Amino acid sequence: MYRSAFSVGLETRVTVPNVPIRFTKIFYNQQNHYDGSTGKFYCNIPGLYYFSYHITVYMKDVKVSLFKKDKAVLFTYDQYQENVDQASGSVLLHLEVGDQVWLQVYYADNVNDSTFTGFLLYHDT
Amino acid sequence: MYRSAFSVGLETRVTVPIRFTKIFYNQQNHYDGSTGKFYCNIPGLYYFSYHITVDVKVSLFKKDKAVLFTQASGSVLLHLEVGDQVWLQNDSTFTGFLLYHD
Amino acid sequence: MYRSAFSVGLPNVPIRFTKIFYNQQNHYDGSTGKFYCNIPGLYYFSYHITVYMKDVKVSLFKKDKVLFTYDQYQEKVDQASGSVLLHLEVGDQVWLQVYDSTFTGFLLYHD
């Protein structure tokens, strides 16, 4: 077991609600573990993963959820001001092969520049 | 000498070390929820990141001194030695992992 | 190939982070505010800075700019955070630029 990472961004001003955000700006996706057609990352190497995301907040409160498998694992709520902020979150999640993770915003506007990043830190041995 | 990571969150307010009791990851049990301190068991470079929701100022402590004075966010790299402890003083997460051992 | 990292803290110019939390390899030049790639590979960069500027955006730059969204005009910025993974080639430079604040970068997978 070895490498798995992806870093992606949202170029589109609106997204979408209650569905996986399909980030289209690919900063990195070498092993293509991030599915650009679904906005979901798929775990092919079991291990500890680090995910980091930032959802643009502008004029409207933002509620984001990091989903793993079929459920929301992490929640971020950010009130606006008023100011462009980022509803950010980072977490370590051990993943098994098959586990998919993606983000959702509970049309969501002014989400452009939002980013979703994740990487295999320690592979299971 | 290879794995040491944790990611925990808050299950309440009041944010003395912050005791995060929500465990996202703590496989090597290096993070102690009773004290809220992470204990370095492998010397090396660690990456710490926290997003905490608390006139209030949040600090990341290494050993017994504040490294960072910061919603309150921060990410940093701290080279730690065995015995070194790191702690902090909508989910509010505190995360840390061994990047490079030694 | 294996270690390259820095953690530093504190318009239209690289942000010179002077508070050095880590810079063992010295790949981060505090006089220019830029990180220089010596070991090609996948790097993680994260940041959280206090800006207090209007009609301004914040982004990591690499050979000049990482995420640039073409959008309609609107206004204001107080603090900004981000994180990205970038595969860097030798010679590549990365820095934070507004077109305890922190800026961390680390080589994760070396080519």
From Swiss-Prot, chain C:
Synthesized exclusively by adipocytes and secreted into plasma. It comes from the Eukaryota. HMW complexes are more extensively glycosylated than smaller oligomers. Hydroxylation and glycosylation of the lysine residues within the collagen-like domain of adiponectin seem to be critically involved in regulating the formation and/or secretion of HMW complexes and consequently contribute to the insulin-sensitizing activity of adiponectin in hepatocytes. O-glycosylated. Not N-glycosylated O-linked glycans on hydroxylysine residues consist of Glc-Gal disaccharides bound to the oxygen atom of post-translationally added hydroxyl groups. O-linked glycosylation in the N-terminal is disialylated with the structure Neu5Acalpha2->8Neu5Acalpha2->3Gal. Sialylated by alpha 2,8-sialyltransferase III. Residues 1-111 form the C1q domain. It is found in: Secreted. Induction: During hormone-induced adipose differentiation and activated by insulin. HMW-complex blood contents are higher in females than in males, are increased in males by castration and decreased again upon subsequent testosterone treatment, which blocks HMW-complex secretion. Important adipokine involved in the control of fat metabolism and insulin sensitivity, with direct anti-diabetic, anti-atherogenic and anti-inflammatory activities. Stimulates AMPK phosphorylation and activation in the liver and the skeletal muscle, enhancing glucose utilization and fatty-acid combustion. Antagonizes TNF-alpha by negatively regulating its expression in various tissues such as liver and macrophages, and also by counteracting its effects. Inhibits endothelial NF-kappa-B signaling through a cAMP-dependent pathway. Homomultimer. Forms trimers, hexamers and 12- to 18-mers. The trimers (low molecular weight complexes / LMW) are assembled via non-covalent interactions of the collagen-like domains in a triple helix and hydrophobic interactions within the globular C1q domain. Several trimers can associate to form disulfide-linked hexamers (middle molecular weight complexes / MMW) and larger complexes (higher molecular weight / HMW). The HMW-complex assembly is also modulated by the degree of lysine hydroxylation and glycosylation. This is Adiponectin. It comes from Mus musculus (Mouse). The chain holds residues 113 to 245 of 247 of the full protein.
